[PDB]
Symmetry: D2
Subunit: 31 residues, 4 copies
């Protein structure tokens, strides 16, 4: 159960990085 929790924390951080990459792309596309 802890291995699931740790893995969820890791997925959240990966999702946050993708989120920053997509916002940078959007920024670039608008300029």
């Amino acid at each position: 159960m802890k291995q699931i929790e740790d893995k969820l924390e890791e997925i959240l951080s990966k999702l946050y990085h993708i989120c920053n990459e997509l916002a940078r792309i959007k920024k670039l596309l608008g300029e």
Copy 2:
């Protein structure tokens, strides 16, 4: 039509936020078990 892509990326960014929140809420429910 580039404007449409940017609009869509904003929609995806928001949809991803919602997924992070739901995933965070699951992480918390498991740390209560």
Copy 3:
């Protein structure tokens, strides 16, 4: 525990739809 499982199925489907949207965007950008 089942409510978590059902919610994970739902998140997977949402992630799949985003995946199709990003591939359509990539397709459009390349053309």
Copy 4:
């Protein structure tokens, strides 16, 4: 520089696949409990 955006979107698409797989693997571990 549009080529760089497309390359990056491919990288994100792949990174998202990996997340779906890890999430699917969690869903399965919970259905075993």
